[PDB]
Structures are given as C-alpha cells and as structure tokens.
Amino acid sequence: MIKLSQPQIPEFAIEKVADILRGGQLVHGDECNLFEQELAEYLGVKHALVVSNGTAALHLALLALNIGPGDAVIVPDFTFTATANIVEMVGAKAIIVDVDKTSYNLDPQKLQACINEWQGPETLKAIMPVLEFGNPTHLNAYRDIAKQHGLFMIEDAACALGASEQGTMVGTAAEFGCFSFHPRATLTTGEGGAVVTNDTELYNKVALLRSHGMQRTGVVFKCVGLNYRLTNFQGAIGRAILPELNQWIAKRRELANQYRELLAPLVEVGKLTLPSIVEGHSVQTYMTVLADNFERSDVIEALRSKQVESNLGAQSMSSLGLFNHKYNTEQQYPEGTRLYTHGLALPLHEGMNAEDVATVVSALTEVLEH
Amino acid sequence: MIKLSQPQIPEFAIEKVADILRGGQLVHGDECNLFEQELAEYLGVKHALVVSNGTAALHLALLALNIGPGDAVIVPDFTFTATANIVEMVGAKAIIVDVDKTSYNLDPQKLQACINEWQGPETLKAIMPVLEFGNPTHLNAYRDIAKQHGLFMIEDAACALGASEQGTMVGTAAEFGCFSFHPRATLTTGEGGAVVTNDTELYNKVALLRSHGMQRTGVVFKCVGLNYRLTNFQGAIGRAILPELNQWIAKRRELANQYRELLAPLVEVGKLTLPSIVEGHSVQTYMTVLADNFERSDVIEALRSKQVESNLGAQSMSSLGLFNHKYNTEQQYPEGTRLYTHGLALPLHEGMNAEDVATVVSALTEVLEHA
Ligand SMILES: CC(=O)N[C@@H]1[C@@H](NC(C)=O)[C@@H](OP(=O)(O)OP(=O)(O)OC[C@H]2O[C@@H](n3ccc(=O)[nH]c3=O)[C@H](O)[C@@H]2O)OC[C@@H]1OCc1c(COP(=O)(O)O)cnc(C)c1O
Ligand SMILES: CC(=O)N[C@@H]1[C@@H](NC(C)=O)[C@@H](OP(=O)(O)OP(=O)(O)OC[C@H]2O[C@@H](n3ccc(=O)[nH]c3=O)[C@H](O)[C@@H]2O)OC[C@@H]1OCc1c(COP(=O)(O)O)cnc(C)c1O
C-alpha cells in the first residue's frame, strides 16, 4: 500500500528511546526541554512548550486566553473536527465561517463579514484559523484582521509546522501557534504537539496549565490545571526528526510538483482540481477535489484495491450537527461543503519517490476512467 | 540514591517498542486494545479504556457523567492536587472533606455529614474518593454512601491499581475507576492512565470523548470531545508490566513489613507514626508522619545528602487557596493538614531489597537524632 504517511524515526532515536526506557527519565525531561528550545529556534519564536497532542495545544491556548463560557471563537468550516470541538469543550461557541476554494483556508472576506456583523450575545474573543494541510495562505491577513478588530488569534497549525507566508513562520504571527505531531504530521512523536508564543506571560500560563498549576521555586500550586505533558521518550523522537524537517518538506514540495505535472491531463479534461502549493506550503497533505459526477467513497475503495491509500482531507463543521450557534444556520457553507464531499487526499510523504507519484496518478486515472 | 521508584520495563517490551517505532503503528493500536482487555480481566470489570494520564481518566469520568458548571463533587482534603483541580476544570466545585488519620483516606463519617448538610446552591452529583497510596480502606463504605445518597462515585485510584477491599478490586465498586501509569505508579507507561467501568453506556461515552467524538459505513462525529489517546508503544509497555504487577505488589508488602519492624524504635519515642498497610493495600507509597518538632524540609534535605529520596506524600486541598467554595472556608481539615505538613514518604519499590530498607531506616534514624 502507498500510504498517506510512513514516518521513519531515525535509528539513533530508537536507540535513545530504548536507553530512556531502560535507565532514563520517563516523564518530561532533558529531551523535552531541549526539543522546546530547538523548536523555538527553528520557528524564530520566543517560547515553545511540548504537550500530549495537537488538540491539547489548542485547548491550552484557549484556557490561557480565558476563553470559556459566554465567549465565541471563529473557526473555518473545513478542518478536522478537533478545531471546533475544542472551542465548545471550554464552554465557548464555535462560529463557523467558510473557506475559500483555492487555499482551503478560512476566507478573509467572509471572516471580515462575520466579525462586522457580530453583535453577541456571546463575547467574540478570538479567531482560530487553520493553516490547512500545511498551506500558510492568508496567515498575515488573519493577523491583520485580528489586530484590526482587537481579537486574539490562535493558529491551528496542526498540519503546518515549517510552513511560512511572506517571512512569517506559521505558528508565530500572533498570540499562539499550535502544532500536532500525529503520524500524518511529517514530524511525529506518535501523539504529541506544541504551543508556541512570543508572549512570556502566556508561556508561563500554559506551562502552569500543562502540569496541574505547578510552579517550581519547592513546588507551589498557582492555579487549577490539567496534565498535558509529553513523555521524555516522545520528546526524544521529535527532536531527532526536527533537524530533518526542512529536507523532508523540500522532498514533499518536489513530489507535489510531480503531481502538478502528472495530474494536468485530468485537470484539463475537468475530472478534478488541484491544491495550490504556494511558496511556503509545507505539503503535509495533497488534496485534490473530484468532479461532482464521481462518488468519492467509491473512488477511495477502488484505489484501496489498487494499493493506494486515499481519504477525504477534512470535515465540514456545519455538516456535523454539533456546532449549533444561531450564526451557523444563517448562511450556507458551499466551499467547505464541496471540499468535505468531493476532496481526495492522495499519498504524499518524504518516503515516496517520483515513480510512486506516477503509480498513484496511474491508479487514479484508471479509477476515474472506469 | 535510593529512589521513590525505579521502574524496570522488561527488555522484551523495550524491543517491542523499538519494533513499533521502526515499522509499526504509533497511534493506539493492537497493543492498546489488548492492554484494555487484559486490564479489564485483571480487575474483573467489564470495560477498560487506556488514556493519556491519570488526570485525563478523571476528566473523562466527570465529562461522561455530565458533571460541569452548576455542579459539585466531594473530594478528600489529602490527595494530589489533580483530584480537586480536575473537578474545577470541568466547571464544578470541589467540596473538601477531611481524611482519616490512620488510612489517609476520605473519612466516611465526615463524608456523611457533608452530604447531610448539603443544600446547594450547586447540585451535588458525585463523590471522588482517593484510594491514597494504594490503600483500599473504606472502598465499600464509599460505594454504600454514594448509593444511599443517589450520588455517582468516581474512584481516584491513580495510586491503587491492584489494591482491593473485602473482595472488591479498587476501581470497580461503582460508576468509574481511574488509574495512573505515572512512573511512581508501579505499572508505568511514562505517562498513562485508564478508565474502567461495568456500565457499557458509560464505556461508549468515554470512548467517544477520548477521540474527538469519533464512532467508526465510516467515521461519524457523534459529540464534541478531546484527544486523550495513549500511543500504541506506551500501551505495549503497560501490558508487558501488568503480568508482573501482583508479584511486585507482594514484594512491596514484604518491604513494608520490614519498615514496620525497623521503624518501631522511632514510633516508640514518638518521633513518627506509620502508615497502616492493611490487607489489600498495594503499597504504591509508604508515608510516615513526622512529629511536629521536626522541620520536614530539613529532614528531606538531610536524607538526600545520605542518598535517600524522600518527599511529602500529597497535598492538603484546603491549604492551597484554590478551592474556595463556602463549605471549604467554614469546615476545618486538621487531619489532611497534618499529613500535608508532616508526612514523609520513604522509598518503597519492587527494585529494593531488605538491605535497602535497613539503609533507609538507618539514615532516617540518624537524621532524626541530630535534628
Ligand atoms: C490532515 C490530517 O492529517 N488530518 C488528520 C485527521 N484525519 C482525518 C481524515 O480527518 C485525523 O486522523 P485520523 O483520522 O485519526 O487518521 P487518518 O487520517 O485516517 O490517518 C491514517 C493514516 O495515517 C498514517 N498513520 C497513522 C497512524 C499511525 O500510527 N501511523 C501511520 O502511518 C497511515 O497512512 C494511516 O493509514 O487526526 C489527525 C489529523 O488531524 C489532526 C488535527 C488536529 C488534532 O491534532 P491531534 O490531536 O494531534 O491529532 C487539530 N487540527 C487540525 C487542523 C488537524 O488536522
Ligand atoms: C503519591 C504519588 O505518587 N504522587 C505523585 C505526585 N507527587 C507528589 C509529591 O505530589 C506527582 O508527581 P511529581 O510531583 O510530578 O513527581 P514526584 O512525586 O516528585 O516523583 C519523582 C520521583 O519519582 C520517580 N520517577 C519519576 C519520573 C520518572 O520519569 N522516573 C522516576 O523514576 C523518581 O524517583 C523521582 O525522583 O504526580 C504523580 C503522582 O500523583 C498523581 C495523581 C494523580 C494524577 O495522575 P497523573 O496525571 O497520571 O500524574 C491523580 N490522583 C492522585 C491521587 C495522584 O496521586
């Protein structure tokens, strides 16, 4: 099977994990602390904190910003369900705004309209744009819009570590950036994530919330908190991969260019559309959109039988019945709905070569012919 | 240093972790599924779910029971701060009740009185007894009290996997049992935990909440949820240790009796009191209480200089200034406060032998002579 991902953890990292298990510290230790330092340096951001997973990162960002009951946060229609779920979990309401069809990211015009029209009853406190599939498109616009309207911005950069727009590293534009180290995420720790910020007060708050409100001095419990700590052995894995991330992103960009060339016939005859792999895109996922006449579920099944793993890219929040703020049924979300219904992620990861891309395109061509 | 714990992960499990990293599934997979089945069998409970940590287990239990804003949960005064924190995190109020001097567990008579006096304004929905340091004392009474008063019971069994009272395994008495696999917890996965229950509807709810509301026609998102999944390689570690747990607990109980014997001279002259290591205690921590005349922080430091790791056992919730419900401001908590201020955990783990216990007792005797 040509898979959506197939992370290769360096053997020296496996050996380090074994050493840690055999005779090292298991909870967050030197490996996690060094990983944080190295992540911060990589991003050019003041602070990083590693955490249990990318959902945990978003959760902690919301909590550190005192977003909760009585509040609202804008999310894109097209994203993984965690983005909207985690807003609701802290007691806030997820306010859905459509994405644009080119980038698959929160549409800045529709975002402006939502903010402009907002009059409560909840207090609109934040935007949570997703840099979907590694696409940084609109990063700086989101920052500008948040600043214009006095909103916090939490980047859901789950799939976008290493991406950048116009000199701004994704995750670093405003209050918080949140990353995932799920096995689809290029840098993986099995489960894992990170919260980054340039604001030391926010860093200190997240550090408390991550581990029971504990401040080292002996230990003082400063506030109520959670446990979202990453193990030291997970940290070891991640920091072993980080020095390779740029090379892996470069490889993914080359593979994407191969897809762009090989898929042009299918585009020209109208059977699908391509993602727009802009400068700074980290190519975490390569999602096409099939023409309406194809049943996407049947295409996935047929590709599986031809040893190609494919899937939808992400969900349409408005389609799920979970985010029932009044705003969310005042208009339709045609772009996110199209991407949810017709989107098709094709394998693209650093373990593939150009021949593997040709294999996938051959299989897809065959399936869409018959 | 003789340490509070020193987990020995079997080499075969390290090899399995390596195999998983090299060529296996990293997210919750067959190892986690088998671990759940084996945990449930070990406990004689219908269902188990492994999760990121013991705090996550408590969190999910609260959420699955719809405990949140407007509600209240009773917690013991003496516990790790997570117990009371996680109640507050879901929007409920932690209502503190003192512990027993002897067992260090929630005092059933003081529990009864708190429930009797409760008249709001919040809705009192649950008790969250802690089986502290692996002590099962009062497990069945907590169940009986919860049933008598129409309350849910969530066992904070973070430190008590393998403990039992009167034939009931800790974690299995009522709605939920919550365990930790932190490195002090005998069975460790570095970080990890488990939620257990006999109620299939509660099981299904927690499984949804643990992974984004996902139900596997294809995936449906049934409800809003979190990510508290344990990795497949953490699951592999935990299920490798579980078959050893009873033997490790038996070893710990042997060591506890060595402490009891050797510490007797200090007890006799009033320098400290001992824990009561009852039948069914899993001996996750061995916590003494120093006499008031000792500065515990100084004892800890002196012991460290003599290659003995020691610490307080747990915190006093009423002492922290975090749990400010009216009830907690009016009630007094002398027992939990004493255990917080004067408790001293001494190393006790399955990697120690009798010689090591003697070493610790020698060092403590020396320190308390020169204090
Ligand atoms: C774009 C993408 O990668 N989405 C993933 C999402 N998948 C779908 C179909 O929705 C969903 O993945 P999942 O459905 O669980 O798995 P999958 O998409 O079917 O991937 C399976 C494939 O991935 C590979 N894989 C697998 C395991 C593993 O251990 N070895 C491995 O190789 C292998 O090829 C598998 O067949 O969640 C992860 C990813 O999303 C998480 C996420 C989050 C939350 O972050 P975390 O809490 O850290 O997860 C926030 N915010 C955004 C915008 C997010 O995208
Ligand atoms: C009794 C006990 O073991 N308490 C731990 C608690 N410690 C203190 C002093 O409060 C506290 O530990 P900590 O203060 O961080 O560390 P420590 O007590 O000083 O232990 C350090 C020693 O432990 C050993 N250790 C360490 C790492 C590690 O990787 N290798 C290792 O060997 C080693 O000897 C270290 O020096 O948290 C864990 C434990 O409590 C968690 C817990 C929870 C929450 O569960 P989780 O979310 O899974 O944690 C709920 N509910 C209850 C009733 C709980 O007790």
PDB file of C-alpha atoms in Angstrom, chain A residues 111-300:
ATOM      1  CA  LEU A 111     -14.198  36.411   8.103  1.00  0.00           C
ATOM      2  CA  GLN A 112     -14.430  40.189   7.937  1.00  0.00           C
ATOM      3  CA  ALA A 113     -18.182  39.964   7.232  1.00  0.00           C
ATOM      4  CA  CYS A 114     -18.761  37.680  10.239  1.00  0.00           C
ATOM      5  CA  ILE A 115     -16.838  39.975  12.564  1.00  0.00           C
ATOM      6  CA  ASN A 116     -18.529  43.073  11.173  1.00  0.00           C
ATOM      7  CA  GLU A 117     -21.992  41.565  11.741  1.00  0.00           C
ATOM      8  CA  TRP A 118     -21.242  40.196  15.217  1.00  0.00           C
ATOM      9  CA  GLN A 119     -23.378  41.727  17.971  1.00  0.00           C
ATOM     10  CA  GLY A 120     -23.497  38.860  20.525  1.00  0.00           C
ATOM     11  CA  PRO A 121     -24.888  37.584  22.695  1.00  0.00           C
ATOM     12  CA  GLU A 122     -21.531  35.930  23.391  1.00  0.00           C
ATOM     13  CA  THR A 123     -18.316  37.919  23.564  1.00  0.00           C
ATOM     14  CA  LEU A 124     -16.343  37.350  20.368  1.00  0.00           C
ATOM     15  CA  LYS A 125     -12.778  36.917  21.613  1.00  0.00           C
ATOM     16  CA  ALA A 126     -10.687  35.092  19.006  1.00  0.00           C
ATOM     17  CA  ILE A 127     -10.136  33.686  15.571  1.00  0.00           C
ATOM     18  CA  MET A 128      -8.767  30.153  15.190  1.00  0.00           C
ATOM     19  CA  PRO A 129      -7.650  29.967  11.553  1.00  0.00           C
ATOM     20  CA  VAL A 130      -6.392  26.616  10.290  1.00  0.00           C
ATOM     21  CA  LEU A 131      -3.314  26.513   8.039  1.00  0.00           C
ATOM     22  CA  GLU A 132      -4.853  23.500   6.430  1.00  0.00           C
ATOM     23  CA  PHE A 133      -2.628  20.730   5.032  1.00  0.00           C
ATOM     24  CA  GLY A 134       0.442  22.932   5.513  1.00  0.00           C
ATOM     25  CA  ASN A 135      -0.912  25.832   3.476  1.00  0.00           C
ATOM     26  CA  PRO A 136       0.176  29.195   5.019  1.00  0.00           C
ATOM     27  CA  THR A 137      -2.056  31.184   2.664  1.00  0.00           C
ATOM     28  CA  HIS A 138      -3.778  34.086   4.442  1.00  0.00           C
ATOM     29  CA  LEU A 139      -1.601  33.833   7.606  1.00  0.00           C
ATOM     30  CA  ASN A 140      -0.672  37.515   7.564  1.00  0.00           C
ATOM     31  CA  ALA A 141      -4.228  38.580   6.612  1.00  0.00           C
ATOM     32  CA  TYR A 142      -5.555  36.704   9.654  1.00  0.00           C
ATOM     33  CA  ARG A 143      -3.044  38.513  11.863  1.00  0.00           C
ATOM     34  CA  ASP A 144      -4.057  41.861  10.392  1.00  0.00           C
ATOM     35  CA  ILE A 145      -7.793  41.152  10.774  1.00  0.00           C
ATOM     36  CA  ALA A 146      -7.349  40.027  14.371  1.00  0.00           C
ATOM     37  CA  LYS A 147      -5.376  43.203  15.157  1.00  0.00           C
ATOM     38  CA  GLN A 148      -7.920  45.411  13.363  1.00  0.00           C
ATOM     39  CA  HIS A 149     -10.747  44.019  15.495  1.00  0.00           C
ATOM     40  CA  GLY A 150      -8.979  43.561  18.843  1.00  0.00           C
ATOM     41  CA  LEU A 151      -9.228  39.738  18.660  1.00  0.00           C
ATOM     42  CA  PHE A 152      -6.812  37.089  19.826  1.00  0.00           C
ATOM     43  CA  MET A 153      -5.505  34.722  17.156  1.00  0.00           C
ATOM     44  CA  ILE A 154      -4.759  31.065  17.868  1.00  0.00           C
ATOM     45  CA  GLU A 155      -3.237  29.383  14.823  1.00  0.00           C
ATOM     46  CA  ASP A 156      -4.382  25.831  14.380  1.00  0.00           C
ATOM     47  CA  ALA A 157      -1.117  24.837  12.750  1.00  0.00           C
ATOM     48  CA  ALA A 158      -1.681  21.141  13.465  1.00  0.00           C
ATOM     49  CA  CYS A 159      -0.611  20.290   9.910  1.00  0.00           C
ATOM     50  CA  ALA A 160       1.724  23.201   9.237  1.00  0.00           C
ATOM     51  CA  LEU A 161       4.993  23.032  11.208  1.00  0.00           C
ATOM     52  CA  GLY A 162       7.626  24.524   8.908  1.00  0.00           C
ATOM     53  CA  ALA A 163       5.188  26.390   6.644  1.00  0.00           C
ATOM     54  CA  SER A 164       5.576  30.164   6.178  1.00  0.00           C
ATOM     55  CA  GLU A 165       3.983  33.124   4.399  1.00  0.00           C
ATOM     56  CA  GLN A 166       5.917  36.241   3.354  1.00  0.00           C
ATOM     57  CA  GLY A 167       8.594  35.730   6.015  1.00  0.00           C
ATOM     58  CA  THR A 168       6.192  34.830   8.839  1.00  0.00           C
ATOM     59  CA  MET A 169       6.670  31.256  10.102  1.00  0.00           C
ATOM     60  CA  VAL A 170       3.316  29.599  10.665  1.00  0.00           C
ATOM     61  CA  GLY A 171       2.565  29.469  14.377  1.00  0.00           C
ATOM     62  CA  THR A 172       4.308  32.780  15.105  1.00  0.00           C
ATOM     63  CA  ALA A 173       2.009  35.514  13.779  1.00  0.00           C
ATOM     64  CA  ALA A 174       0.079  36.406  16.945  1.00  0.00           C
ATOM     65  CA  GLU A 175      -0.696  35.116  20.459  1.00  0.00           C
ATOM     66  CA  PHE A 176      -0.372  31.364  19.948  1.00  0.00           C
ATOM     67  CA  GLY A 177       0.624  28.718  17.475  1.00  0.00           C
ATOM     68  CA  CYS A 178      -0.472  25.127  17.931  1.00  0.00           C
ATOM     69  CA  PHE A 179       1.158  22.126  16.220  1.00  0.00           C
ATOM     70  CA  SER A 180       0.461  18.387  16.082  1.00  0.00           C
ATOM     71  CA  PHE A 181       2.956  15.541  15.954  1.00  0.00           C
ATOM     72  CA  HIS A 182       0.374  12.941  14.866  1.00  0.00           C
ATOM     73  CA  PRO A 183       1.823  10.398  12.394  1.00  0.00           C
ATOM     74  CA  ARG A 184       0.385  12.266   9.412  1.00  0.00           C
ATOM     75  CA  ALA A 185       2.214  15.494  10.545  1.00  0.00           C
ATOM     76  CA  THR A 186       5.689  14.979   8.997  1.00  0.00           C
ATOM     77  CA  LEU A 187       7.377  15.415  12.410  1.00  0.00           C
ATOM     78  CA  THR A 188       5.736  12.751  14.586  1.00  0.00           C
ATOM     79  CA  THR A 189       6.013  11.590  18.179  1.00  0.00           C
ATOM     80  CA  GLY A 190       3.140   9.102  17.790  1.00  0.00           C
ATOM     81  CA  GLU A 191       0.945  11.518  19.650  1.00  0.00           C
ATOM     82  CA  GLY A 192       2.288  14.948  20.526  1.00  0.00           C
ATOM     83  CA  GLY A 193       2.049  18.654  19.949  1.00  0.00           C
ATOM     84  CA  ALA A 194       3.373  22.052  20.841  1.00  0.00           C
ATOM     85  CA  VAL A 195       2.214  25.504  21.885  1.00  0.00           C
ATOM     86  CA  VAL A 196       4.394  28.428  20.844  1.00  0.00           C
ATOM     87  CA  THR A 197       4.192  32.136  21.677  1.00  0.00           C
ATOM     88  CA  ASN A 198       6.273  35.314  21.790  1.00  0.00           C
ATOM     89  CA  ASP A 199       4.488  36.402  24.973  1.00  0.00           C
ATOM     90  CA  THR A 200       6.258  35.293  28.151  1.00  0.00           C
ATOM     91  CA  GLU A 201       3.141  35.758  30.308  1.00  0.00           C
ATOM     92  CA  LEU A 202       1.185  33.434  28.012  1.00  0.00           C
ATOM     93  CA  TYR A 203       4.094  30.932  28.034  1.00  0.00           C
ATOM     94  CA  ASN A 204       4.141  30.922  31.822  1.00  0.00           C
ATOM     95  CA  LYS A 205       0.357  30.429  31.949  1.00  0.00           C
ATOM     96  CA  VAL A 206       0.445  27.474  29.544  1.00  0.00           C
ATOM     97  CA  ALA A 207       3.318  25.889  31.494  1.00  0.00           C
ATOM     98  CA  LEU A 208       1.195  26.038  34.646  1.00  0.00           C
ATOM     99  CA  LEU A 209      -1.920  24.680  32.921  1.00  0.00           C
ATOM    100  CA  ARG A 210       0.055  21.791  31.346  1.00  0.00           C
ATOM    101  CA  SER A 211       1.009  20.347  34.724  1.00  0.00           C
ATOM    102  CA  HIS A 212      -1.518  20.894  37.482  1.00  0.00           C
ATOM    103  CA  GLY A 213      -0.753  24.573  38.090  1.00  0.00           C
ATOM    104  CA  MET A 214       2.725  23.635  39.415  1.00  0.00           C
ATOM    105  CA  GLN A 215       5.436  26.287  39.672  1.00  0.00           C
ATOM    106  CA  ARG A 216       8.912  25.244  40.811  1.00  0.00           C
ATOM    107  CA  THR A 217      10.522  27.554  43.371  1.00  0.00           C
ATOM    108  CA  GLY A 218       9.678  23.821  46.456  1.00  0.00           C
ATOM    109  CA  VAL A 219       6.550  23.374  44.353  1.00  0.00           C
ATOM    110  CA  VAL A 220       3.674  25.874  44.535  1.00  0.00           C
ATOM    111  CA  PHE A 221       0.250  25.187  43.040  1.00  0.00           C
ATOM    112  CA  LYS A 222      -0.620  28.528  41.487  1.00  0.00           C
ATOM    113  CA  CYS A 223      -3.874  27.720  39.689  1.00  0.00           C
ATOM    114  CA  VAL A 224      -6.087  24.817  38.661  1.00  0.00           C
ATOM    115  CA  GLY A 225      -4.739  22.921  35.666  1.00  0.00           C
ATOM    116  CA  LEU A 226      -4.546  19.717  33.675  1.00  0.00           C
ATOM    117  CA  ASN A 227      -1.977  17.101  32.690  1.00  0.00           C
ATOM    118  CA  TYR A 228      -0.923  17.542  29.087  1.00  0.00           C
ATOM    119  CA  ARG A 229       2.739  16.615  29.481  1.00  0.00           C
ATOM    120  CA  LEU A 230       4.645  14.770  26.766  1.00  0.00           C
ATOM    121  CA  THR A 231       6.935  11.902  27.823  1.00  0.00           C
ATOM    122  CA  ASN A 232      10.694  12.331  27.648  1.00  0.00           C
ATOM    123  CA  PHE A 233      10.938   9.449  25.134  1.00  0.00           C
ATOM    124  CA  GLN A 234       8.324  11.052  22.870  1.00  0.00           C
ATOM    125  CA  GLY A 235      10.348  14.265  23.118  1.00  0.00           C
ATOM    126  CA  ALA A 236      13.480  12.342  22.113  1.00  0.00           C
ATOM    127  CA  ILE A 237      11.756  11.150  18.944  1.00  0.00           C
ATOM    128  CA  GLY A 238      10.573  14.601  17.971  1.00  0.00           C
ATOM    129  CA  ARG A 239      13.863  16.387  18.475  1.00  0.00           C
ATOM    130  CA  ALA A 240      15.604  13.653  16.456  1.00  0.00           C
ATOM    131  CA  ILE A 241      13.291  14.398  13.499  1.00  0.00           C
ATOM    132  CA  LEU A 242      13.305  18.215  13.671  1.00  0.00           C
ATOM    133  CA  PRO A 243      16.778  18.606  12.014  1.00  0.00           C
ATOM    134  CA  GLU A 244      15.416  16.635   9.041  1.00  0.00           C
ATOM    135  CA  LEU A 245      12.147  18.548   8.707  1.00  0.00           C
ATOM    136  CA  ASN A 246      13.320  21.096   6.144  1.00  0.00           C
ATOM    137  CA  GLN A 247      14.740  18.344   3.935  1.00  0.00           C
ATOM    138  CA  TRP A 248      11.517  16.356   4.233  1.00  0.00           C
ATOM    139  CA  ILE A 249       9.443  19.441   3.343  1.00  0.00           C
ATOM    140  CA  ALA A 250      11.700  20.079   0.335  1.00  0.00           C
ATOM    141  CA  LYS A 251      11.183  16.482  -0.780  1.00  0.00           C
ATOM    142  CA  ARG A 252       7.387  16.835  -0.352  1.00  0.00           C
ATOM    143  CA  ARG A 253       7.450  20.024  -2.452  1.00  0.00           C
ATOM    144  CA  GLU A 254       9.279  18.165  -5.228  1.00  0.00           C
ATOM    145  CA  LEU A 255       6.701  15.368  -5.091  1.00  0.00           C
ATOM    146  CA  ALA A 256       3.913  17.945  -5.232  1.00  0.00           C
ATOM    147  CA  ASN A 257       5.450  19.423  -8.391  1.00  0.00           C
ATOM    148  CA  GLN A 258       5.441  15.924  -9.874  1.00  0.00           C
ATOM    149  CA  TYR A 259       1.738  15.583  -9.069  1.00  0.00           C
ATOM    150  CA  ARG A 260       1.093  19.011 -10.594  1.00  0.00           C
ATOM    151  CA  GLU A 261       2.674  17.938 -13.877  1.00  0.00           C
ATOM    152  CA  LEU A 262       1.240  14.416 -13.981  1.00  0.00           C
ATOM    153  CA  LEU A 263      -2.314  15.458 -12.995  1.00  0.00           C
ATOM    154  CA  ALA A 264      -2.559  18.239 -15.600  1.00  0.00           C
ATOM    155  CA  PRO A 265      -4.425  15.994 -18.131  1.00  0.00           C
ATOM    156  CA  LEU A 266      -7.062  15.117 -15.535  1.00  0.00           C
ATOM    157  CA  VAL A 267      -7.437  18.828 -14.692  1.00  0.00           C
ATOM    158  CA  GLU A 268      -7.628  19.869 -18.337  1.00  0.00           C
ATOM    159  CA  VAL A 269     -10.448  17.381 -19.066  1.00  0.00           C
ATOM    160  CA  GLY A 270     -12.367  18.552 -15.991  1.00  0.00           C
ATOM    161  CA  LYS A 271     -12.198  15.486 -13.716  1.00  0.00           C
ATOM    162  CA  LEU A 272     -10.527  17.192 -10.747  1.00  0.00           C
ATOM    163  CA  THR A 273      -8.909  20.330  -9.368  1.00  0.00           C
ATOM    164  CA  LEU A 274      -5.548  20.608  -7.675  1.00  0.00           C
ATOM    165  CA  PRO A 275      -4.406  22.158  -4.418  1.00  0.00           C
ATOM    166  CA  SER A 276      -2.474  25.412  -4.826  1.00  0.00           C
ATOM    167  CA  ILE A 277       1.006  24.632  -3.497  1.00  0.00           C
ATOM    168  CA  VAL A 278       2.210  28.174  -2.871  1.00  0.00           C
ATOM    169  CA  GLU A 279       5.604  29.330  -1.704  1.00  0.00           C
ATOM    170  CA  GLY A 280       5.938  28.298   1.939  1.00  0.00           C
ATOM    171  CA  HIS A 281       3.400  25.441   1.739  1.00  0.00           C
ATOM    172  CA  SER A 282       4.763  22.511   3.786  1.00  0.00           C
ATOM    173  CA  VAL A 283       2.697  19.925   1.863  1.00  0.00           C
ATOM    174  CA  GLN A 284       1.501  17.932   4.848  1.00  0.00           C
ATOM    175  CA  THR A 285      -1.444  16.723   2.722  1.00  0.00           C
ATOM    176  CA  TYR A 286      -2.014  16.900  -1.030  1.00  0.00           C
ATOM    177  CA  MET A 287      -5.790  17.190  -1.501  1.00  0.00           C
ATOM    178  CA  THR A 288      -7.435  17.267  -4.904  1.00  0.00           C
ATOM    179  CA  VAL A 289     -11.153  17.883  -5.476  1.00  0.00           C
ATOM    180  CA  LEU A 290     -13.054  15.385  -7.663  1.00  0.00           C
ATOM    181  CA  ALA A 291     -15.701  16.434 -10.140  1.00  0.00           C
ATOM    182  CA  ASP A 292     -19.274  16.111  -8.861  1.00  0.00           C
ATOM    183  CA  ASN A 293     -20.093  13.084 -11.052  1.00  0.00           C
ATOM    184  CA  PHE A 294     -17.747  10.810  -9.077  1.00  0.00           C
ATOM    185  CA  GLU A 295     -18.806   9.099  -5.878  1.00  0.00           C
ATOM    186  CA  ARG A 296     -15.781   9.874  -3.728  1.00  0.00           C
ATOM    187  CA  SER A 297     -16.328   6.898  -1.377  1.00  0.00           C
ATOM    188  CA  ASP A 298     -16.252   4.544  -4.379  1.00  0.00           C
ATOM    189  CA  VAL A 299     -13.061   6.179  -5.643  1.00  0.00           C
ATOM    190  CA  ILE A 300     -11.394   5.590  -2.260  1.00  0.00           C
TER     191      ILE A 300
END
